[PDB]
Ligand binder design. Structure first.
Ligand SMILES: *[C@@H]1O[C@H](CO)[C@@H](O[C@@H]2O[C@H](CO)[C@@H](O[C@@H]3O[C@H](CO[C@H]4O[C@H](CO[C@H]5O[C@H](CO)[C@@H](O)[C@H](O)[C@@H]5O[C@H]5O[C@H](CO)[C@@H](O)[C@H](O)[C@@H]5O)[C@@H](O)[C@H](O[C@H]5O[C@H](CO)[C@@H](O)[C@H](O)[C@@H]5O)[C@@H]4O)[C@@H](O)[C@H](O[C@H]4O[C@H](CO)[C@@H](O)[C@H](O)[C@@H]4O[C@H]4O[C@H](CO)[C@@H](O)[C@H](O)[C@@H]4O[C@H]4O[C@H](CO)[C@@H](O)[C@H](O)[C@@H]4O)[C@@H]3O)[C@H](O)[C@H]2NC(C)=O)[C@H](O)[C@H]1NC(C)=O
Ligand code: JYV
Ligand SMILES: *[C@@H]1O[C@H](CO)[C@@H](O[C@@H]2O[C@H](CO)[C@@H](O[C@@H]3O[C@H](CO)[C@@H](O)[C@H](O)[C@@H]3O)[C@H](O)[C@H]2NC(C)=O)[C@H](O)[C@H]1NC(C)=O
Ligand SMILES: *[C@@H]1O[C@H](CO)[C@@H](O[C@@H]2O[C@H](CO)[C@@H](O[C@@H]3O[C@H](CO)[C@@H](O)[C@H](O)[C@@H]3O)[C@H](O)[C@H]2NC(C)=O)[C@H](O)[C@H]1NC(C)=O
Ligand SMILES: *[C@@H]1O[C@H](CO)[C@@H](O[C@@H]2O[C@H](CO)[C@@H](O)[C@H](O)[C@H]2NC(C)=O)[C@H](O)[C@H]1NC(C)=O
Ligand SMILES: *[C@@H]1O[C@H](CO)[C@@H](O[C@@H]2O[C@H](CO)[C@@H](O)[C@H](O)[C@H]2NC(C)=O)[C@H](O)[C@H]1NC(C)=O
Ligand SMILES: *[C@@H]1O[C@H](CO)[C@@H](O[C@@H]2O[C@H](CO)[C@@H](O)[C@H](O)[C@H]2NC(C)=O)[C@H](O)[C@H]1NC(C)=O
Ligand SMILES: *[C@@H]1O[C@H](CO)[C@@H](O[C@@H]2O[C@H](CO)[C@@H](O)[C@H](O)[C@H]2NC(C)=O)[C@H](O)[C@H]1NC(C)=O
Ligand SMILES: *[C@@H]1O[C@H](CO)[C@@H](O[C@@H]2O[C@H](CO)[C@@H](O)[C@H](O)[C@H]2NC(C)=O)[C@H](O)[C@H]1NC(C)=O
Ligand code: NAG
Ligand code: NAG
Ligand code: NAG
Ligand code: NAG
Ligand code: NAG
Ligand code: NAG
Ligand code: NAG
Lengths: 211, 226, 311, 38
């Protein structure tokens, strides 16, 4: 299904309008879902929310017809970044098989975090296997978007590099990896190998060499 | 009090019957509703179907022609079967308990009501890949270190996702950072796990790296040292 | 020829078809140009062809004329008067039968306020008796003479059509505008009537007592529902705010009484018609235009129209 | 209509009736009278 974006400043109140409006008396469910994780039923009956969910998550009861179903998130924090689904049931329409669209809430105004680059040389057991791989691990950066640049000594290297797209951590920051593959001869025949990690407007370098 | 745990093959050949199971812990199984939900890459949450407390089944018309949901009351295990799988069937299959809600708007006598279901407690998810490619166990290599220092455990060339990683058989839990995998052009994922430990702990707190790739039942271990 | 589908399925079995979403080609202000419009028609106003094709119920028998929606179907009390040189004589006997010598008589120039309410089975918004509950028939021993009972206590009835309808004007020509049923805002519910089960049981017993005087203290009388006939006579048909209700009354005449609830009420499932036919001549019928909003009228039931079958 | 197509001005509001051409629109003086007793 399609995804409709939404941006809310940090600490504000979010207003997520439901995808499909009800034609009659409704019963709307709200699920909080972050990709690669189990969804969390925020609100089951039009305004009933289960235990373990803060009072800042609220819905609209079905009092008089015409009121649209909207999920309200007061005091938005960086953890509120997820996909929110409007499971719309009503008297008129049939069985609500589809969960509907997906509101991609992105909380703005979060503090900028600098990466924590760490480069590892090829292991001995790997070199014993006639293969060699540099790994450049990046973590604790926000906003989650970086650029990796590999250099053999001073000359650039782009043949043999693989990079992960940033992924959100449990502390609401991001992390990515970079794997440069090279024959063990290329690892020895060069003086050093560097991994330049450019995040926002700054670059950070971690280098390694066979010594 | 009630938790759910999925379990699947991880890899299923194209045009073959997928099969997953879901164990309920703490509560019974024949007194609640249970729903299968999957989430594909790029596509949103899709409701597969559900089964009642009386073990009555109702399938989503999107995949009604090839899904069979069951239940085993001897314990708390409910199963799912999906035949004629294609590449588009690869997703994270979740398992959740559906609660029946009776929304009444008019008179219950005339039938002016309707039933809505909602999943209140979910499982954790089972990754399932549909590919003609065969399974392969990973190859673990140590990453020796050099305020504090950091060591790692490289897990390269396995298929398919995922791979669980724990340090010291679950003892070391602080400062651990397991990174997402990398799908190389060869078609195999490559992972890397790293912990940040104090420098003085280098001699000689043994750091054992645990790696488990169930689609090949190839658990391995490896120690790191300068 | 109407192309009809059910409007909004998934309600309660044979209920989606009780009202249909019908679309049809229609004339316009220009005689040479057509228009494809739609309208919500009740099932009681359409018949199939034998496919999903329908037609209005009246087309093979009667012409149709929609009421000018500015006129009000609300009954207003009427006073009948006698011309000069004439007189109206009122029988002020509180236990009067309808025929015979009335001992207390008074003269009036005009009768009291008489609302011209046209109902069936149940006499609505009428005048009450002051003593007992009288029973009037010309030959009560004849089973083919309708019994007209008249309560002394009003047993209240609450009727409603809860659907929030919309009236969509459709110009069928220069000056002519047919008012169709646009759609339904909110829930598609069922029209019904409530009557207090306690008061109806109490008032149904008074009729039994007064019926014993014509058939014996020992006999047993029984209430059954209508034995067939047209729709207007088998149901409590009447008019409530403009729409013409047709209420099933099996829940009101389903009781046997021997020789000698208290909280809830008994509801009456009512259907609704729009093309109501004429009660006298054939070849004529009226289209009741759709009433917007929610309809709910509160009225008294002051009498009945019963019928014996010849314990 | 919006081409050279037209319609009569009244068609979207009112029905139309042409006067019987034998009748005369010429005003004739009228004398209003009161009944007897007035
Ligand atoms: C002629 O005679 C006719 C026949 O009698 C008569 O018809 C009657 O019509 C009226 C209206 O036209 C009908 O009234 C409706 O009744 C509905 C049902 O209400 C009953 O049930 C609910 C829910 O019951 C569940 O939950 C409670 C606890 O909450 C449990 O105790 C129950 O056991 C049950 O839970 C179990 O069971 C479920 C299934 O059975 C399981 O799924 C569940 O897991 C559990 O196991 C009760 O809450 C009601 O209690 C209220 O009423 C009692 C008296 O009965 C009062 O003491 C007090 O006021 C209570 O609050 C009741 O028992 C109502 O749902 C409905 O009202 C809603 O719908 C309308 C339109 O649909 C809305 O406009 C309205 O605003 C209401 O919306 C609220 O509620 C819904 C439902 O949850 C919410 O989704 C919605 O968001 C909104 O929530 C807001 O308000 C809530 C309270 O209102 C509040 O809690 C929320 O936090 C939020 O603020 C409507 O009133 C009536 O049923 C007809 N009669 C019959 C017999 O059917 C007609 O009127 C007569 N007259 C004429 C024609 O003139
Ligand atoms: C609806 O009834 C009608 C429908 N359509 C016309 C009509 C069309 S066009 C025309 C003019 N035409 C050109 C000249 C004469 C014809 N010539 C061409 C020969 N008159 C009617 N006219 C008198 C009517 C009645 O009084 C009557 O029978 N009711 C009215 C009151 C109710 C009523 C209330 N509340 C009720 C209805 C159903 C259930 C319960 C209560 C009962 C029946 C009447
Ligand atoms: C009775 O049936 C008619 C069809 O013959 C229904 O009319 C059609 O209803 C659909 C659904 O609402 C309309 O499509 C909608 O169009 C809007 C405007 O572009 C769009 O935003 C929606 O997403 C949807 O596609 C359609 O236009 C409409 N057509 C006409 C001619 O009215 C009618 O709603 C039915 N009525 C009832 C009471 O069921
Ligand atoms: C029996 O008599 C009673 C009392 O005269 C009738 O009740 C009347 O019903 C009409 C329509 O059902 C009511 O008119 C409506 O008023 C509301 C409120 O202003 C308005 O929103 C509507 O559009 C409509 O105009 C009227 O107020 C009401 N009168 C009273 C005193 O309640 C009843 O309909 C009669 N029943 C029969 C079968 O004759
Ligand atoms: C006009 O058509 C209606 C619809 O068929 C006819 O009403 C039916 O009459 C038959 C008897 O011939 C009944 O068995 C059906 O139940 C009636 N249909 C109903 C009530 O919906 C009506 O007879 C026709 N009128 C004429 C003059 O032919
Ligand atoms: C239903 O019956 C009650 C009881 O007779 C009516 O209320 C009386 O109405 C008369 C006529 O105006 C008054 O003189 C009485 O004083 C009223 N008594 C009470 C206790 O209200 C009521 O008007 C009737 N309702 C309808 C719609 O006819
Ligand atoms: C029936 O539906 C109409 C709309 O189709 C409702 O009219 C609305 O009433 C509210 C009253 O708060 C107004 O604010 C809106 O502007 C009205 N809308 C229109 C289009 O008129 C009406 O309230 C409904 N009736 C009931 C009883 O719910
Ligand atoms: C029919 O409806 C009327 C009004 O909607 C009901 O009369 C009300 O009864 C309550 C009893 O708690 C009183 O508090 C109100 O003042 C009454 N309203 C009026 C306008 O008199 C009546 O009870 C209903 N009867 C049935 C059988 O449903
Ligand atoms: C019938 O059609 C006429 C012709 O367009 C309409 O008259 C126009 O009304 C608009 C306002 O909506 C004016 O701006 C134009 O000047 C009018 N045209 C004239 C005077 O030639 C008329 O409103 C239509 N009637 C209806 C009921 O829709
Ligand atoms: C309306 O619904 C009834 C009951 O489901 C069904 O039998 C009938 O065929 C439906 N009619 C149309 C036109 O869909
Ligand atoms: C209206 O007429 C056309 C013929 O031009 C026909 O195809 C269509 O089905 C008609 N519409 C209805 C609702 O009968
Ligand atoms: C009606 O009551 C009068 C009162 O005397 C009586 O003579 C007459 O026989 C009664 N008629 C019927 C049909 O009950
Ligand atoms: C009343 O009907 C009965 C039979 O139904 C008959 O014997 C009797 O003569 C009738 N009474 C009158 C006054 O006609
Ligand atoms: C019938 O019983 C009543 C008492 O309820 C009594 O007054 C009356 O005289 C009795 N009549 C006959 C004919 O038995
Ligand atoms: C009378 O009641 C019987 C009992 O089920 C029912 O079959 C019949 O349709 C009812 N008649 C009317 C006119 O309601
Ligand atoms: C009237 O209602 C009874 C039960 O309430 C039902 O059996 C009967 O069929 C109904 N009659 C009609 C004509 O719908």
């Amino acid at each position: 299904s399609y995804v409709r974006p939404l941006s809310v400043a940090l600490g504000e109140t979010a207003s997520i309008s439901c995808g499909r409006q009800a034609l009659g008396s409704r019963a709307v469910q709200w699920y909080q879902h972050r990709p690669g994780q189990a969804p969390i039923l925020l609100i089951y009956n039009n305004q009933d929310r289960p235990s373990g969910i803060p009072e800042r998550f609220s819905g609209t009861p079905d009092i008089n017809f015409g009121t649209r179903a909207t999920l309200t998130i007061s005091g938005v924090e960086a953890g509120d970044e997820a996909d929110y689904y409007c499971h719309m049931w009503d008297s008129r329409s049939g069985f609500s098989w589809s969960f509907g669209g997906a509101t991609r809430l992105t909380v703005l105004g979060q503090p900028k975090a600098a990466p924590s680059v760490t480069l590892f040389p090829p292991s001995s057991e790997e070199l014993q296997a006639n293969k060699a791989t540099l790994v450049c691990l990046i973590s604790d950066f926000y906003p989650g978007a970086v650029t990796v640049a590999w250099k053999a000594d001073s000359s650039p290297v782009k043949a043999g590099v693989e990079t992960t797209t940033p992924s959100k951590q449990s502390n609401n920051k991001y992390a990515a990896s970079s794997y440069l593959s090279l024959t063990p001869m290329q690892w020895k025949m060069h003086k050093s190998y560097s991994c330049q990690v450019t995040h926002e407007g700054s670059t950070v370098e971690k280098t390694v060499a066979p010594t | 009090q009630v938790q759910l745990q999925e379990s699947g093959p991880g890899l299923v050949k194209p045009s073959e019957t997928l099969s997953l199971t879901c164990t309920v812990s703490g509560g019974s199984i024949s007194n609640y509703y249970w729903s299968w939900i999957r989430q594909s890459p790029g596509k949103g949450l899709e409701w597969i179907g559900y089964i009642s407390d009386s073990e009555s089944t109702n399938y989503n018309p999107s995949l009604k022609s090839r899904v069979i949901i069951s239940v085993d009351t001897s314990k708390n295990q409910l199963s799912l079967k999906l035949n004629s799988v294609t590449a588009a069937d690869s997703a994270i299959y979740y398992c959740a308990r559906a609660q029946q809600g009776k929304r009444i708007y008019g008179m219950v006598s005339f039938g002016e009501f309707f039933y809505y279901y909602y999943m209140d407690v979910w499982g954790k998810g089972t990754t399932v890949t549909v590919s003609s490619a065969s399974t392969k166990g990973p190859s673990v290599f140590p990453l020796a270190p050099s305020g504090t220092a950091a060591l790692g455990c490289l897990v390269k060339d396995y298929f398919p996702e995922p791979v669980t990683v724990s340090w010291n058989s679950g003892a070391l839990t602080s400062g651990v950072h397991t990174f997402p995998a990398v799908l190389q052009s060869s078609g195999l994922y490559s992972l890397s796990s790293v912990v940040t430990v104090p420098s003085s702990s280098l001699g000689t707190q043994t750091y054992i790296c645990n790696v488990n790739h169930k689609p090949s039942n190839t658990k391995v271990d490896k120690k790191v040292e300068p | 020829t109407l192309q009809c589908t059910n409007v909004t399925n998934a309600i309660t079995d044979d209920m989606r078809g009780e009202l249909k979403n019908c679309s049809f080609n229609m004339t316009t202000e220009l005689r040479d140009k057509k228009q494809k419009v739609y309208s919500l028609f009740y099932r009681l106003d359409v018949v199939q062809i034998n496919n999903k094709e329908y037609r209005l119920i009246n087309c093979n028998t009667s012409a149709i004329t929609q009421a000018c929606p500015k006129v009000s179907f609300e009954p207003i009390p009427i006073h009948y008067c006698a011309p000069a040189g004439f007189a109206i004589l009122k029988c002020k006997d509180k236990k009067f039968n309808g025929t015979g010598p009335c001992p207390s008589v008074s003269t009036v120039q005009c009768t009291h306020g008489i609302k011209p309410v046209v109902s069936t089975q149940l006499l609505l918004n009428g005048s009450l008796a002051e003593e007992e509950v009288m029973i009037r028939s010309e030959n009560i021993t004849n089973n083919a003479k309708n019994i007209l009972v008249q309560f002394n206590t009003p047993v209240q009835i609450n009727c409603t059509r809860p659907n929030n309808n919309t009236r969509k004007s459709i110009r069928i020509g220069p000056g002519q505008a047919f008012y169709a049923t646009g759609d339904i805002i909110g829930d598609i519910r069922q029209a019904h009537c409530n009557v207090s089960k306690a008061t109806w049981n109490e008032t149904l017993g008074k009729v039994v007592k007064q019926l014993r005087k014509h058939f014996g203290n020992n006999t047993i009388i029984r209430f059954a529902n209508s034995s067939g006939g047209d729709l207007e006579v088998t149901t409590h048909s009447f008019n409530c705010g403009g729409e013409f209700f047709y209420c099933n009354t099996s829940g009101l005449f389903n009781s046997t009484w021997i020789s000698n609830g208290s909280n809830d009420s008994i509801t009456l499932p009512c259907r609704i018609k729009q093309i109501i036919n004429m009660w006298q001549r054939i070849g004529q019928a009226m289209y009741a235009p759709p009433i917007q909003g929610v309809i709910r009228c509160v009225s008294n039931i002051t009498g009945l129209i019963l019928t014996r079958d010849g314990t």
